Amino acid sequence: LMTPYLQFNRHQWAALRDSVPMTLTEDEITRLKGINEDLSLEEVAEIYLPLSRLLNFYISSNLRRQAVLEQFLGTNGQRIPYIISIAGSVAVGKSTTARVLQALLSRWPEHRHVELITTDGFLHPNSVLKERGLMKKKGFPQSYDMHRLVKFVSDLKSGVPQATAPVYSHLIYDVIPDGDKTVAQPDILILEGLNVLQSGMDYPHDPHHVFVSDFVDFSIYVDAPEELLKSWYINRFLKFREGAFTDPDSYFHNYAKLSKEEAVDIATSLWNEINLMNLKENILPTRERASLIMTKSANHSVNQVRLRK
Amino acid sequence: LMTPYLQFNRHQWAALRDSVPMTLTEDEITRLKGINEDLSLEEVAEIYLPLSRLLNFYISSNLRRQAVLEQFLGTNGQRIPYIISIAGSVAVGKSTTARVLQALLSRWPEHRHVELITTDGFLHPNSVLKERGLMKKKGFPQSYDMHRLVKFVSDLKSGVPQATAPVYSHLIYDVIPDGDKTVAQPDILILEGLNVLQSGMDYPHDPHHVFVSDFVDFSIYVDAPEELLKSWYINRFLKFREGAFTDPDSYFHNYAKLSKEEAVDIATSLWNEINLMNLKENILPTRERASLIMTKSANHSVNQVRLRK
Ligand SMILES: Nc1ncnc2c1ncn2[C@@H]1O[C@H](COP(=O)(O)OP(=O)(O)O)[C@@H](O)[C@H]1O
Ligand SMILES: Nc1ncnc2c1ncn2[C@@H]1O[C@H](COP(=O)(O)OP(=O)(O)O)[C@@H](O)[C@H]1O
Ligand SMILES: CC(C)(CO)[C@@H](O)C(=O)NCCC(=O)NCc1cccnc1
Ligand SMILES: CC(C)(CO)[C@@H](O)C(=O)NCCC(=O)NCc1cccnc1
Known part of the structure; x- marks a missing residue:
């Protein structure tokens, strides 16, 4: 009921x-x-x-509260960003959703400065994944430097004047050497990643005791059926392949060199053997921890939104 | 830092x-x-x-956000209780703290109906603890029907008109059979117990994927150093023993039969072997999940309040 x-x-x-x-x-x-x-x-x-309007009501309530608390706290404390997280399957549309919300939230006078950080950057570099036999487990808990990610959001919620995040490129399929992004007390930070609702229980090999979610104000899980996700993943793979036709520095250039049919077969296997397994074991069980669940159907069309009471 | x-x-x-x-x-x-x-x-x-005045700022802010959201979302506007949890070591003073805050919060016209539920009630009864060899682990994660506790706060955060909790009695050291407490959509529910900041990681024998904290608006961890907790545990034990001097139906009548020195040695060993181990392994590591940490000194006086930024 x-x-x-x-x-x-x-x-x-x-x-x-x-x-x-x-x-x-x-x-x-x-x-x-x-x-x-x-x-x-x-x-x-x-x-x-x-x-975006729903989120502005949440952010605005927080800012009004902060202004009240400043009455006795005083107005000398640091600016603390409001943090929205975005979780869900590989290829469900987290990055698109994040970028769209970044663009829309930037409107409001209360919160013009909106940063976007992806948790991809906190993956261990390929050389370390290789050292650990984790190269086909990219996106699984063991593939993340989860302590660094928790420290990043912790530092933001501590009022540091700047915090720095490593950055990943899907184009080179690795963490970018020396490509770190620095944020400086934005009004909002959007943290996008499959693992943003995970906790210590997901990292028993190296546990943490305060979670990403303990530093997040509002979390969205973007949900969709497995059959759609597979299609979206494969289509995206083919678009990266196309992009690589004329970019021998793309990791996808290896796949541009193959027939389209064989590229599809590779993408299908990567989905089935890695990303689907990750979804079932590690991502989907976190869905009910979200503030809001947004469900998609064919052609990315949202057919249900559920918001915590 | x-x-x-x-x-x-x-x-x-x-x-x-x-x-x-x-x-x-x-x-x-x-x-x-x-x-x-x-x-x-x-x-x-x-x-x-x-x-309590601080808490009112948070509670009042949440009430006004609810009102804004109800008009925006076009919902009916059922009441959802504001839930405050209180964690900490055995004998730090959670129950006294909870009962004082219950009495003080109820003086505010915006939130006069304040209920108090302790998580002790959700321990497995002694009969079940005996079946599983857990009588010396009372208060450890394996001793709780955790799924039932999560379900209780989940139902409250679902707008159920009534929810029923099992009730424990320290005087008979067990769950009261057919002694259930029913609450009906209070303005505030205070949930008091050592395990309110624990999560699925603490229950690897029987995992859950949505935590008590996912249904709690504000959490307090009451903190004190080990040496004070020990003296407070022993003094309380001795007081219950004294109470039992004239009450043969008290569980503590058993200890009234011993010499005082032996009762003290027993209390000390219970502390050292059960409640202290539980603090170090299961309770203390949850402290930094709290919205607010309230630290106590000599004579129970509070010497530090830390609040999440
Ligand atoms: N709302 C949308 N409308 C149309 N296409 C979308 C939408 N959201 C995502 N996509 C497409 O689906 C694929 C997966 O989206 P992406 O944002 O890359 O997923 P994630 O970041 O969750 O891995 C991409 O090819 C992207 O262009
Ligand atoms: N604020 C306080 N002032 C004086 N005594 C206190 C205070 N808080 C707790 N106590 C005493 O300390 C002991 C532990 O308190 P209690 O509320 O039973 O702890 P808990 O519920 O955390 O196990 C009891 O003997 C109680 O009377
Ligand atoms: C875990 C992510 C970084 C989350 O954004 C995911 O994109 C990923 O690379 N998952 C590992 C499996 C996969 O889809 N790899 C892509 C790939 C690309 C080129 C060659 N082999 C594999
Ligand atoms: C786990 C609790 C239920 C926390 O509310 C605790 O009071 C307890 O029974 N701990 C088990 C060990 C113990 O101290 N047993 C006897 C006892 C119980 C209550 C007060 N003094 C002594």
């Missing part, structure tokens, strides 16, 4: 966009199309604009 | 205390002494009144 979530179907969620009227400007439409050419502006208006 | 907690200084804490007329009548003072005869009214003035 009753669950910890308010549940919206698409009709009810899209109905929210008039409760408070919002409309994209030309400049914004151009950013959004630059984030993802396949992303529907209709989908932005019906789904992501209401979601 | 900065950490995720601000530590109140005397000017900030004074400003919190002085922010309202906290208007304690003679009858209220009498009821507070009824909670614990060794409770200092000076601690109530200097510590518990301001702590």
Whole structure:
């Protein structure tokens, strides 16, 4: 019967966009199309604009509270960013969702400065994964420097003036040597990664006792059926392959050299043997820890939103 | 070094205390002494009144956010209780702290109905602990029906009109058969017990993937050094033993039959072998999951309050 979530179907969620009227400007439409050419502006208006408005109500409540607490705390303390996390399967659309929300949240005067950090950067470099026999376990708990990731969000929630994150490139399939990103007290930080709702129980080989989620204000799990995820993963793989036709520095150039059919077979096996296993064992069991679960159907169309009561 | 907690200084804490007329009548003072005869009214003035005032800021902020969200989302607006949890070592004073905060929080017109549930009630009964060889592990993760405790706070955070909890009695050292406490959508529920900051990692014999903390709005860990906890545990034990001098149906009547010196040696060994081991292995490592850490000194006086930034 009753669950910890308010549940919206698409009709009810899209109905929210008039409760408070919002409309994209030309400049914004151009950013959004630059984030993802396949992303529907209709989908932005019906789904992501209401979601950005929902989040502004949460962020605004936090800022009002902070202003009250400053009455006795005093206004000398550090600026602490509001942290939104985005979890879900490999290839469900976390990066797209994060980039879209970054663009939309940047509107509001209360919170113009929005940073985006992906947990990919906190993977151990390939040389270390190789040393440990983990090269086909990339994305599994053992492949992350999870202590460093927890320290990064901890430091942000400690009010450090700057914190630095390592960065990964899907193009070179590795952590970028000397490519670290520095953030400086943003209003919002969006942390995107499959493992953002994981905890010490997922890392029994090297446990931690305070979790990423203990430093996150609001978490979104993007959900979809396995059959869709596989299709989206394979399609994305083929787009990276296309990108590599003329980029011999892409790791995907190895696959550009193969027939499309054989590339598809490789991508299918990577999905089945690595990412699907990761989803079932490590990602999906964390879904019910999210503040909000956003479910997708064919063509990336959101068909359900569930929000913690 | 900065950490995720601000530590109140005397000017900030004074400003919190002085922010309202906290208007304690003679009858209220009498009821507070009824909670614990060794409770200092000076601690109530200097510590518990301001702590409860702090909590009201958080509770009140959450009420107004709920109201904003209800109009935006078009939902009916069922009440969801605000849940405060209180963790810490055996004998640190969780129950006294919980009962004082219950009495003080209920004085605010915005949240007059405050319930208190202890996690002791969710221990497996002695009959079950005996079946599993766990009578000397009472309070350890294996001794709790943890799934049932998570379900209780989950149901509350689902808007169920009523929820039922099993109840424990320290006087018979067991779960009261058919003694269940039913709560009905209070404004606030205080959940008191040593395990409220524990998670799936602490229960590898029977894992859960959504934690008590996932249904708790604000958590307090009451902290004190080991040497004080020990003396407080022993003094309490001796007091229960004294109470049993005239009560043969008390579980502690058993210890009233011993000599005082032997009762003391027994209490000391219970501390050292059961409750202290539990503190080090299972309780203390959860401390930094708390919204607020309240540290106690000699005579139970609070000498430090740390609050998440
Ligand atoms: N809302 C969307 N509309 C259209 N395509 C999308 C959408 N979200 C994701 N995609 C596409 O699906 C694939 C996976 O998205 P991505 O953001 O790369 O996933 P993740 O970051 O979760 O691995 C990509 O090819 C991306 O272009
Ligand atoms: N604030 C306080 N002032 C005086 N005595 C206290 C205070 N808090 C707890 N105590 C005493 O310390 C002992 C432990 O407290 P209790 O509330 O039973 O601990 P817990 O519930 O954490 O096991 C008891 O003897 C109790 O009377
Ligand atoms: C764990 C991630 C970093 C999360 O974003 C995922 O993208 C990944 O590389 N998973 C490992 C399996 C996979 O999809 N590898 C891609 C790949 C690419 C080129 C050659 N072999 C494999
Ligand atoms: C685990 C608790 C239920 C925490 O609420 C604890 O009181 C307890 O029974 N610990 C087991 C060891 C113990 O101290 N047993 C006897 C005892 C029980 C209560 C007070 N003094 C002594």
